[PDB]
Amino acid sequence: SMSYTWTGALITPCAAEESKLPINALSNSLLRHHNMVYATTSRSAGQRQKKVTFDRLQVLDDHYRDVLKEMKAKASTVKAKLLSVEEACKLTPPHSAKSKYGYGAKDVRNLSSRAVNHIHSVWKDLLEDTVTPIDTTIMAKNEVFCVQRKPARLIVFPDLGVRVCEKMALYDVVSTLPQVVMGSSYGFQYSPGQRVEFLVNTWKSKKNPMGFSYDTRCFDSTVTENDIRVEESIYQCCDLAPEARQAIKSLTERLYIGGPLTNSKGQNCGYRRCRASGVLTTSCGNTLTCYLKASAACRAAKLQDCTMLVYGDDLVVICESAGTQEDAASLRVFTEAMTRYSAPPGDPPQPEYDLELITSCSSNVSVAHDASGKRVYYLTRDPTTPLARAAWETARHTPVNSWLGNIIMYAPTLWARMILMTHFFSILLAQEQLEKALDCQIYGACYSIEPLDLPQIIERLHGLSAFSLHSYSPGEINRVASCLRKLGVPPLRVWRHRARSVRARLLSQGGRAATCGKYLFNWAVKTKLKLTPIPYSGGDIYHS
Ligand SMILES: CNC(=O)c1c(-c2ccc(F)cc2)oc2cc(N(Cc3cc(F)c4c(c3)COB4O)S(C)(=O)=O)c(C3CC3)cc12
């Protein structure tokens, strides 16, 4: 079965699209090499269409069925509830795409009679009809990168009314089932500090640890009808209301397995027979499907004492080494098994014998030291894309503020602290916008967050140590320094000078502002203060 069929109609935009980095009076203070930063547009959609369109073959063996039976046995212990229309509505983001039938996201959130009436009719239709394919819109995503250019990724999503109905049927399922089925292997359950702790203790639990990342090429396209039906059979193991069972069956048959693709102008672009990236079950589905295939592939490879970590289509296995040559042999068998299950790799997997050399979800573990001199592990990444996006966001207001998301999730890193915090707090000070809530996206969920609350948020996610880390590793410092030279960002010495000023300015304002000065910028001062404590990817999900 081909992942997609195409009619020839183009994937069209719904608004003007910029590819070139916008420049304002603040741009050069962050980044000088402007031509290295670009945004993707619908003009490259055709190139992506070629990449994501291919034939899938699946061969399923006993290892696959054995693991599935185990997953279903765990799923059988889960009890999930239907959300009411009101509850589902409150989970709808304020800036979620409006319905084709005369209401928007704010009408949903307000429980307006028109929006509520349509939702009730869509739900009734799901209960009454389990066959008619549901329409979807296909769009090119506009995302920002540094050169070496990527073609635009594609998003596929149904109408707002359907999206609310997905929440009613499945929000409690996708929120509760994966952790029960996959246990400690389900990566979404951890804060950044908990995840790094899990990874470290997992590495030390093995006598001779070996680990590897495995990244599938265009995972969404490798997901077959079988895969999506097997996912449904897992959901249906739950203790559910009969009305929920029918809605889940209907959504699977009419939406999740496949459907027609329509562009922004209303033309049929073709047909999908693989994972839709903009449905509620995308994250949960990919995570279950990746975990199933990978667990079965570990058994085929005879890998000893495996601990897996899975987040969507991102996979890491840490296991007991059988020797360097034996380990390398077993990874080939793994890849062969994964390939028979439809999930061949982008690059072949590599065994690693140092935890810090495994990269996954674009991240790796590194080490720094706290105020006492004790080693502290933390998750970091190559800062090139965060910084390119920060540059765009310096001159353009965007729907999601990646800089804010990055400060929160990478708070302990030397690049988030020295550059992102310093740059954006300076901007916020100048416009007196410290108290203004901003949208950012964490694990695919949209959150509205006031910058003034960052200290409390960072402590809870990473611990108090995130405000006093020092003596970073030579490898991490060198990667950061090299990235700055590459993009024409000023060197770290300049950012320390700027941070002193930004800190002084925050202290001057007092209150929560001064708390941001004290905690976020203690690294900048020569004589430190002793810091005490402070008193659904594509799923269309929102939280306060
Ligand atoms: C690969 N599997 C894992 O679970 C992860 C490893 C990893 C595992 C094993 C290794 F050996 C090395 C790294 O490192 C990780 C780092 C993160 N973070 C970064 C991050 C990545 C993202 F894609 C997103 C977000 C954050 C927010 O919203 B996004 O969807 S972090 C520092 O916030 O914790 C995550 C996040 C998304 C859950 C997972 C892993």
UniProtKB/Swiss-Prot annotation:
Effect of residue 286 to K: Complete loss of RdRp activity
Required cofactor names: Mg(2+)
Regulation: Activity is up-regulated by PRK2/PKN2-mediated phosphorylation.
Signal peptide coordinates: none
Variant or mutagenesis effect after changing residue 220 to G/N: Complete loss of RdRp activity
Post-translational modification: The N-terminus is phosphorylated by host PRK2/PKN2.
Domain RdRp catalytic: 209-327
Localization in the cell: Host cytoplasm; Host endoplasmic reticulum membrane
Reactions catalysed: RNA(n) + a ribonucleoside 5'-triphosphate = RNA(n+1) + diphosphate
Membrane topology: Single-pass type IV membrane protein
Residues that bear Phosphoserine: 29, 42
Listed result of changing residue 313 to E/H/N: Complete loss of RdRp activity
Annotated effect of mutating residue 282 to C: Almost complete loss of RdRp activity
Outcome when changing residue 281 to V: Almost complete loss of RdRp activity
Subunit structure: Homooligomer. Interacts with non-structural protein 5A. Interacts with host VAPB. Interacts with host PRK2/PKN2. Interacts with host HNRNPA1 and SEPT6; these interactions facilitate the viral replication. Part of the replication complex composed of NS2, NS3, NS4A, NS4B, NS5A and the RNA-directed RNA polymerase embedded in an ER-derived membranous web.
Job of this protein: RNA-dependent RNA polymerase that performs primer-template recognition and RNA synthesis during viral replication. Initiates RNA transcription/replication at a flavin adenine dinucleotide (FAD), resulting in a 5'- FAD cap on viral RNAs. In this way, recognition of viral 5' RNA by host pattern recognition receptors can be bypassed, thereby evading activation of antiviral pathways.
The protein's name in its UniProt record: RNA-directed RNA polymerase
Shown residues within the full chain: 2420 to 2982 of 3010
